[PDB]
Amino acid sequence: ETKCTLKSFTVEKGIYQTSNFRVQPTESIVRFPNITNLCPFGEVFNATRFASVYAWNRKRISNCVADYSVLYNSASFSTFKCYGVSPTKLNDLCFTNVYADSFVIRGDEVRQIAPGQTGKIADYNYKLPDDFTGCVIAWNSNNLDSKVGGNYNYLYRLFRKSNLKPFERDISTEIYQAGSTPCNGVEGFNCYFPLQSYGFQPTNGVGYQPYRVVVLSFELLHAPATVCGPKKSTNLVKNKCVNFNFNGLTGTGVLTESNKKFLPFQQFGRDIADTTDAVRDPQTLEILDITPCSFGGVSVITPGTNTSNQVAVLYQGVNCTEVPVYSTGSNVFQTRAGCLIGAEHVNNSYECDIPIGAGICASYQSIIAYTMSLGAENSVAYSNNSIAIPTNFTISVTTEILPVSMTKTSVDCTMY
């Protein structure tokens, strides 16, 4: 690695910085508020009585937390097909509100409920808008409608030339006598009720059995979202490098218990420069603490390619408890400047050759790391009536090198 970074086949004596390491994350945890306020969707599907198609029942649903997965896998429905919306993703969307449409129809009229379709009830009783509808659920009801239901309790409207606009109800019961020329040229005659009754019998077939139909219409981006799907959560771990997603606040670190105290309305604290330092989990309402995972650069100490081919590797600013071929290596030496491995420790002290730091610097006699020695040691015998006078002299010559100039360069401007 040193040869790669230096981009050479020879390396001189010294210390070099190759790369850096970090502690990898292990698992992921996500947490969400303790309770899950459900929605009264039970009264919709398991309702007692549903009105006729011409007077189908409305209801408005909002500020709910409802799960469609528990309903999607339910097998108590004749058909569940949705337009433009993947059912498995229904738990990962947020809407402003929804409208629920409830009625009961014949067995063969199921296919008529679709945008841009033709039919008596698709254009005279309920018209689907020329866009995406939430979707339609239909299920069999012969056990509570074709067996104990009233003979004429359900009605439709066989009234033509009055194509209703989408989401329109005409519950006005007016006898359809034109009273003008285009009805046998007479007034009063041709008076036929715009509505008609279903004719059903116990086990009368497939296209005539009653079918309970509920249509869900969604509203998206009309207002701030109030109804959403539930989100799964998991337990927590401690003293491990983990990434977390606490209530939308995401980040990586190690989790510890904290002694601080929060006022009952904050959600998460910080210290300075937008660095999160304390979060409280929604389930337990306990205050935690975040610590960044350890990382740092590595370094190699080598006595020179020419001399030998053995090196000592030093990790900077890491307490040697989790370093991980240099996993165990040789005598691990933990100093104030990190952890050094691959070299021995001696008790003596000598001159300084390859600086390391914190007062220690290693040398190649294997590789030995010791404590720096400041030099020799002596004490002069001071006394108030004694002086020392030299008797011989020597003349020495020294050298001193000083740069005074550098190369005069010039780069072309537009050519470059």
Ligand X SMILES: *[C@@H]1O[C@H](CO)[C@@H](O)[C@H](O)[C@H]1NC(C)=O
Ligand Y SMILES: *[C@@H]1O[C@H](CO)[C@@H](O[C@@H]2O[C@H](CO)[C@@H](O)[C@H](O)[C@H]2NC(C)=O)[C@H](O)[C@H]1NC(C)=O
CB 117 → ligand X: shortest distance, Å?
27
- Give CA–CA dist 240/230, Å, rounded: 28
188 lines the binding site for ligand Y (CB under 6 A): no
349 lines the binding site for ligand Y (CB under 6 A): no
Nearer to another protein, 80 or 262 (CB): 262
Residues that bind another protein (CB under 8 A): 17, 22, 60, 62-63, 223-224, 226, 250, 252, 261-263, 265-275, 278, 292, 295-297, 316-317, 336-337, 355, 357-359, 361, 372, 374-390, 400, 402-406, 409, 411, 416
Nearer to ligand Y, 157 or 280 (CB): 280
- The residue from 4, 10, 60, 393 that contacts ligand X (CB under 6 A) is 10
- Give CA–CA dist 86/90, Å, rounded: 7
Please list the residues that pair with 155 across neighbouring strands.
Answer: 197
Within 347-406, the residues that bind ligand X by CB under 6 A are 347
Helix (H) or strand (E) segment spanning residue 277:
strand 276-279
Nearer to another protein, 73 or 409 (CB): 409
Q: Which backbone phi and psi does 5 adopt, to 5 degrees?
A: -65, -45
Task: Determine the 3-state secondary structure of 85 from DSSP.
Answer: coil
Distances (CA, A) of 201 to 149, 277, 337: 10, 70, 91
345 interacts with, out of ligand Y, another protein, ligand X, none, CB within 5 to 8 A per kind: ligand X
Q: How far is CA 164 from the centre of its chain?
A: 45
Nearer to ligand Y, 311 or 369 (CB): 369
415 interacts with, out of another protein, ligand Y, ligand X, none, CB within 5 to 8 A per kind: none
Contact map string, positions 309 to 328, toward ligand Y, x by CB under 6 A: ----------x-x-------
- Nearest alpha-carbon partner for 368 in 300, 312, 293: 312
- Nearest alpha-carbon partner for 300 in 20, 52, 28, 7: 20
AA letter at 250? T
306 lines the binding site for ligand X (CB under 6 A): yes
- Give CA–CA dist 402/399, Å, rounded: 10
- Judged by CB under 6 A, which stretch of 191-199, 229-237, 278-286, 362-370 contacts ligand Y? 278-286
- Give CA–CA dist 295/309, Å, rounded: 28
Pairing between β-strand 338-341 and β-strand 312-316 as defined by DSSP bridges? antiparallel
Binders of ligand Y: how many residues, by CB under 6 A? 13
Contact positions vs ligand X (CB under 6 A): 10, 306, 345, 347
Residues within the interface to ligand Y (CB under 6 A): 34, 41-42, 45-46, 283-285, 319, 321, 334, 392, 394
